[PDB]
Design a protein around this ligand. Sequence first.
Ligand SMILES: *[C@@H]1O[C@H](CO)[C@@H](O[C@@H]2O[C@H](CO)[C@@H](O)[C@H](O)[C@H]2NC(C)=O)[C@H](O)[C@H]1NC(C)=O
Ligand SMILES: *[C@@H]1O[C@H](CO)[C@@H](O[C@@H]2O[C@H](CO)[C@@H](O)[C@H](O)[C@H]2NC(C)=O)[C@H](O)[C@H]1NC(C)=O
Ligand SMILES: *[C@@H]1O[C@H](CO)[C@@H](O[C@@H]2O[C@H](CO)[C@@H](O)[C@H](O)[C@H]2NC(C)=O)[C@H](O)[C@H]1NC(C)=O
Ligand SMILES: *[C@@H]1O[C@H](CO)[C@@H](O[C@@H]2O[C@H](CO)[C@@H](O)[C@H](O)[C@H]2NC(C)=O)[C@H](O)[C@H]1NC(C)=O
Ligand code: NAG
Ligand code: NAG
Ligand code: NAG
Ligand code: NAG
Ligand code: NAG
Lengths: 234, 366, 49
Amino acid sequence: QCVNFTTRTQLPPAYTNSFTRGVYYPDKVFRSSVLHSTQDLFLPFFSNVTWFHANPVLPFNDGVYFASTEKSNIIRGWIFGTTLDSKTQSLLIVNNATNVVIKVCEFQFCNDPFLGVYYMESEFRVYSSANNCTFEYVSKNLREFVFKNIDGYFKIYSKHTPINLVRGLPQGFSALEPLVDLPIGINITRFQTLHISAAYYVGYLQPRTFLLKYNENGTITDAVDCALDPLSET
Amino acid sequence: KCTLKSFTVEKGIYQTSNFRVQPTESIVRFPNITNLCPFGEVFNATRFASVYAWNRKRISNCVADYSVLYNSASFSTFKCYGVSPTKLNDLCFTNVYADSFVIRGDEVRQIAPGQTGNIADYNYKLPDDFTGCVIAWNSNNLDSKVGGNYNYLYRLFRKSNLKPFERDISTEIYQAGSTPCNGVKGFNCYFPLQSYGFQPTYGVGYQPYRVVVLSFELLHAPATVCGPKKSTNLVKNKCVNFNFNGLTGTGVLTESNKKFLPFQQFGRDIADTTDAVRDPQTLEILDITPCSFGGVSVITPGTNTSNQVAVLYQGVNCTEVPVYSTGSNVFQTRAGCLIGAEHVNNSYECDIPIGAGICASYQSII
Amino acid sequence: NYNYLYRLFRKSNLKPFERDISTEIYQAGSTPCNGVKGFNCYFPLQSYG
Ligand SMILES: *[C@@H]1O[C@H](CO)[C@@H](O[C@@H]2O[C@H](CO)[C@@H](O)[C@H](O)[C@H]2NC(C)=O)[C@H](O)[C@H]1NC(C)=O
Ligand SMILES: *[C@@H]1O[C@H](CO)[C@@H](O[C@@H]2O[C@H](CO)[C@@H](O)[C@H](O)[C@H]2NC(C)=O)[C@H](O)[C@H]1NC(C)=O
Ligand SMILES: *[C@@H]1O[C@H](CO)[C@@H](O[C@@H]2O[C@H](CO)[C@@H](O)[C@H](O)[C@H]2NC(C)=O)[C@H](O)[C@H]1NC(C)=O
Ligand SMILES: *[C@@H]1O[C@H](CO)[C@@H](O[C@@H]2O[C@H](CO)[C@@H](O)[C@H](O)[C@H]2NC(C)=O)[C@H](O)[C@H]1NC(C)=O
Ligand SMILES: *[C@@H]1O[C@H](CO)[C@@H](O)[C@H](O)[C@H]1NC(C)=O
Ligand SMILES: *[C@@H]1O[C@H](CO)[C@@H](O)[C@H](O)[C@H]1NC(C)=O
Ligand SMILES: *[C@@H]1O[C@H](CO)[C@@H](O)[C@H](O)[C@H]1NC(C)=O
Ligand SMILES: *[C@@H]1O[C@H](CO)[C@@H](O)[C@H](O)[C@H]1NC(C)=O
Ligand SMILES: *[C@@H]1O[C@H](CO)[C@@H](O)[C@H](O)[C@H]1NC(C)=O
């Protein structure tokens, strides 16, 4: 149940700097006050971030860093897949107050996928149909997320932080804890971002090498890019 | 003598072998387990569909305890074809499929690899390579009706047979002859489906029998569906072997005060050596210490002189010695545990250096 | 031909070049056999079709 829209809002994408954000815990192994070198798919430091202020379709590539600097739980929905229709197994995610809810099958979407708020909200008109599937899973502020998919396992790493800077990303460091794991394998090439009735940043990750520092409590406090510049390589 | 391959030994200290404390018992502690598959709705279902309309169910991502199914004696027929039922709780595949229906008592044997029949050719056909099990049981008191239960139908007429894992519910008027029929029965046109006449008064082999066939699937997705595991009792302060959630190894387990963030499961110190684990059941941080070991050594005054020796255990506390379990007055030193040589309070020069500033000589042995 | 036989159930395995000819009921399940197969007990020998 949906129709088209006339206010075809396409604000041109701006570009900004990533600084030192987008580090997540690689392993489930506790460590204490140690420097560990690891090769993994990370967001390279001081890279280009494609700032968005309708919603296009972006390639997923290997792994995607997604950030939303919102106020009081704005961001809700995510759509992932190769064809994003009833031809190929699609994936849908809705963030909820407690946790996230995930549906894995073929939903038929229109040009304007949106949730809708009624003024207490009750409106679910993002898609139109869903024939067959099995997998369903249920469990001011910048919310960061890292989405990855490796060998039949889709992983979502989450983080919430408070900030008062208005323009861009802050100059801070915070490791991204693992939140959700999925032992499911479906082909994904593209994804979108869902509207509600708002600026967000997107970044693309590459396989590189990093050095991490663990404090006495098993938390990451500092990271160094291996192959960025001579000092960091040393 | 065996080590030196000689019948005479000169005075001195010789390394012979090593002492290692053996394990005492095995402790396995797997997590709290959950997510049992819904078998109850299968074998306690209100009603099963027709044989040619056999109900298909998929089971995935849940623990499937086959012990309760196996030990139950309420099912007349329990025939597993692919593998033995006993080991099903050990090995498992990535999916399960259940085919539930009702047949006659005589048709029970028809559902097997290398079997043919009206059901096996017009209602449900299985491959000769089929692996799994079949569970059949009489339901005369339930499915059969005193007035004749015709709710169950079976395909009787069909031009061709049924392929394996194929369900057909077509109601096409079977045309045995060459005379076409426009949906109306005639001389050479009949109904392929016939209603069963299940009744309580019917004899053995005619009563309704509910049959559910279980098969196991190996799609390239990881295996997720099989029986639960076993959890032993945790012990402490004893050199034992453990299987904590797949992390297997030996050592002595004590209590630790270290802190884990709520998402790690186990830690390590350096060089990837497991040093602390959390029990997957009560969520507390334990600690692992290697079982004590160390080479043994022999101090002798020379085969020519005498024939009594002293034994040294390197870097082992004098708490666990064990024929040399008691011997003579045991002496404890920093270098290790010394057996057979009595301690004196005097001070002479050194004959056979022992370690940590202490050493022995021949008076007996001192 | 039903004159040829094979063992299918046993308590454990067998040593190399070791032949076992003990023809006894096998306690397949927890139910004791007590000389009768009944349930959880079956004859561990079978022929070839
Ligand atoms: C590591 O975690 C421990 C356990 O909480 C911290 O120790 C206490 O932490 C609380 C809250 O974080 C503080 O209110 C206490 O003052 C801390 N006490 C001590 C003695 O540290 C500890 O601060 C954390 N960080 C480090 C580096 O140990
Ligand atoms: C169908 O219902 C019966 C009766 O409730 C179940 O039999 C019980 O199974 C549990 C399994 O843990 C046992 O602990 C009980 O002792 C059983 N009771 C009786 C009277 O047999 C049966 O398990 C159900 N079917 C399935 C497939 O679960
Ligand atoms: C598995 O979960 C059960 C949930 O009940 C745990 O049982 C509780 O354990 C706590 C901590 O020891 C007790 O305070 C409760 O009284 C227990 N409730 C019961 C037994 O109903 C259990 O500890 C968990 N771990 C296992 C079983 O290994
Ligand atoms: C050898 O083992 C004995 C135990 O029989 C140790 O003595 C104990 O040591 C602990 C730790 O220092 C103390 O808390 C106990 O009070 C001691 N008990 C007794 C009876 O002495 C001894 O320390 C161990 N020696 C070595 C070198 O490891
Ligand atoms: C990103 O690239 C654009 C051109 O493609 C450039 O104008 C901009 O300065 C770049 N930003 C960063 C942070 O590198
Ligand atoms: C999150 O899910 C719970 C579980 O149904 C629900 O009670 C709660 O209202 C949800 N949060 C929302 C809708 O913001
Ligand atoms: C992805 O597509 C390839 C070929 O296009 C196929 O072999 C593979 O099974 C697919 N993986 C999925 C659907 O998870
Ligand atoms: C053994 O010791 C005695 C006394 O010192 C000596 O006479 C003899 O030669 C020794 N024999 C050997 C084989 O060392
Ligand atoms: C050494 O001195 C201690 C101190 O009391 C005494 O108990 C022990 O018997 C003495 N041993 C010898 C061999 O003199």
